[PDB]
């Protein structure tokens, strides 16, 4: 119980898992506050990693309204990724996503998850088309093993 970071995260449940590549991201998030009032900004970043390319892409962003001291639970529905920009190889590969919350432009928490995307029928997996068809990409989040990072920001 050290004396830092007034907003602590208690639990992040991924509600739509597995889901299609094109489905939005359902995050029920519960946290705790204190209470300076500057609203908390939540963002979900898509990071994909090919041979020659490292591609990051901001899926969606939401800001939480009042700063209620105590335990709070809200749901983050993030817009699915823009496959146009993703390197073609990483569409049906392992990628990550970065759920990150921040205060007054300074992020204090960043929860990263492993995402496995793969095709939904056995013949697409055995023989994938020369051009990826995102309609048959089903993503699957390693939600049980979150890679959490915490940073020290100045709230007051």
């Amino acid at each position: 119980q050290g004396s830092s970071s007034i907003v602590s995260l208690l639990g992040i449940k991924v509600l739509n898992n597995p889901a299609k590549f094109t489905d939005p991201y359902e995050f029920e998030i519960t946290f705790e506050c204190l209470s300076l009032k500057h609203d908390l900004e939540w963002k979900l970043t898509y990071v994909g990693s090919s041979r020659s390319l490292d591609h990051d892409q901001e899926l969606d962003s939401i800001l939480v309204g009042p700063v209620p001291v105590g335990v709070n639970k809200f749901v983050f529905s993030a817009d699915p990724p823009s496959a146009e920009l993703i390197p073609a190889s990483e569409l049906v590969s392992v990628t990550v996503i970065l759920l990150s919350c921040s205060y007054d432009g300074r992020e204090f928490v960043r929860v990263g998850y492993y995402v496995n995307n793969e095709y939904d029928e056995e013949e697409l997996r055995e023989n994938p088309p020369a051009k990826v068809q995102v309609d048959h990409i089903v993503r699957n989040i390693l939600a049980e093993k979150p890679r959490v990072t915490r940073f020290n920001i100045v709230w007051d």
Partner: antibody
Amino acid sequence: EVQLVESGGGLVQPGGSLRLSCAASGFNVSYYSIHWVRQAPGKGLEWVASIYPYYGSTSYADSVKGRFTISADTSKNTAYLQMNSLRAEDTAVYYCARGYGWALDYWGQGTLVTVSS
Amino acid sequence: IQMTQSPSSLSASVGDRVTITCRASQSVSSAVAWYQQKPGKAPKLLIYSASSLYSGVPSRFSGSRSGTDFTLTISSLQPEDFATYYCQQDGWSLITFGQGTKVEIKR
């Protein structure tokens, strides 16, 4: 202040059983990941086991799969590595370390675990 | 196990520029970190997520990846940098460490 301190190291006989614990100061163990990394003398780092926040849930190296178990008690703010059916090759220093995303920022000083007859 | 790291040993001089490459099994840039270990002490974090340097590490340390070949670069070797450097791969199911690279002062 933030720090990690392992204990329980010692001598055990082949077949034996030993429980390490690592005591958390500052951060509280419930919000971070907690990992056990071992180093045989004059050998490299080897990852033993990992426990992830919010949902418990454990990863284990195959050499220790089934014999070791990893846990954390938020009330006593400590994590444990219960090593049973110990073998000679588990002889090493056992560091406990706190997770920084996919990495490990803070490391205990490490206890020596000797397994020999 | 143990990812291949090269060179496995290295004699350098102060002010040299060293590059250690870790031949990893996956391309995911988040999952690779780089550690420094002085003898009889716990290893400390240098680079996390392939390229981001841990708070309070000198700017001479820098990490970069190329496919599945991650590398740590020390732009100007300082006396205090002589040590053993390990790379790590926090994978889907396993964590893996490299054999380590020991860097010793030429005299």
